[PDB]
């Protein structure tokens, strides 16, 4: 059984970053060469492992987290980074073991007239913990007066749309991101490289 990376990387649709998707990868042979050897990926950054050595290693499980952000935010998907995405949407731990893979998805995720279906969280009182997800849509209280669920002055809907049009600057173009995290618990190693 080959690991279902096809379903991860070649999926028709991707998650918004605030509602980022996680897929557990288990009980399979993981050929990482189809990935690291590819010209398809403009980010391929590995932490606590060497990408060239991936086909040699076994892990308890692999998790594939996936979502869309804009080009200029891809740098935030790395350990020790801060910003609206890292702080309020998707957070890697300082001691991350895994790989960050990204590619430009302008051709799929932009639309003439703008694609507004991808959202991120703009307002949040505190930073996310690593691998935390917040899909809440409570009106954000920016003053001393309670909002009572009503959008207005000092009372902000917490989510904002990206506006992806194909002729956007690359900083404003959509990028698909896949985060592979590797766990090596005191348990059987179910995900092994072919070699």
């Amino acid at each position, epitope marked *: 059984n080959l690991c279902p990376f096809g379903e991860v990387f070649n999926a028709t649709r991707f998650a918004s970053v605030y509602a980022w998707n996680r897929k557990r990868i288990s009980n399979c042979v993981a050929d990482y060469s189809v990935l690291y050897n590819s010209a398809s990926f403009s980010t391929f950054k590995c932490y606590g492992v060497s990408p060239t050595k991936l086909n040699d290693l076994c892990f308890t499980n692999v998790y594939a987290d996936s979502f869309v952000i804009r080009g200029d935010e891809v740098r935030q998907i790395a350990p020790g980074q801060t910003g609206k995405i890292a702080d309020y949407n998707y957070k890697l731990p300082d001691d991350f073991t895994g790989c960050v893979i990204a590619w430009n998805s302008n051709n799929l995720d932009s639309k003439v007239g703008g694609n507004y279906n991808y959202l991120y969280r703009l307002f949040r009182k505190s930073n996310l913990k690593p691998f935390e997800r917040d899909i809440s849509t409570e009106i954000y209280q920016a*003053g001393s007066t309670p909002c009572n669920g009503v959008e207005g002055f000092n009372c902000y809907f917490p989510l904002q749309s990206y506006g992806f049009q194909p002729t956007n600057g690359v900083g404003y173009q959509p990028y698909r991101v896949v985060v592979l995290s590797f766990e090596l618990l005191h348990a059987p190693a179910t995900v092994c490289g072919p070699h």
Partner: antibody
Amino acid sequence: EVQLVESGGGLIQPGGSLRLSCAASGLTVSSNYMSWVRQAPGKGLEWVSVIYSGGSTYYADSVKGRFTISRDNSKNTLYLQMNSLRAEDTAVYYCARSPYGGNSWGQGTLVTVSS
Amino acid sequence: DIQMTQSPSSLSASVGDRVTITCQASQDISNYLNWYQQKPGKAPKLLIYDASNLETGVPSRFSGSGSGTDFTFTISSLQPEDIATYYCQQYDNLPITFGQGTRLEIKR
């Protein structure tokens, strides 16, 4: 409804330290994106620093390693700690809700760096 | 950094004239541009947010347009109280950057 009142401006020697205050009413400082922006006499506007609600902080390259932005929740006050001050830091310093949320600016406070 | 080039540096115009100021961003800033009016010794006041939106309380003689890199700010009919320096600002990218300003002078 929103009032931002800066204070702490005055003469300070080159290499000296000064802390600016911005007392807010009608918003919660710690709940907002809050910035300092400066304007040298007869020149344009220059963004200095930002603090996010979650606490992340960013700085203009010109003030990197010298200035610190901070807040006190109980006083509902934003601060800018300016160390190792140079003549080029002479400016009116404004606090603002920036870059997101309702657009509000204080009246400003003038800092002079001179021997 | 994103540079904001503002034109012209200064203009002189009569009461009643249509006035046009341009701002150009050095890379795409979508519609995340603000226009401010600064009267000497006072803080900048927001006139136009997100390229084209009139801040509440601002007279309807003020307008703005544009998206991407090219932006314009217009006073349809210049009033005496419109003597100020006008700044563009891109806000969605750090560092936040401003245009150099347009000093608006009146001929009489």
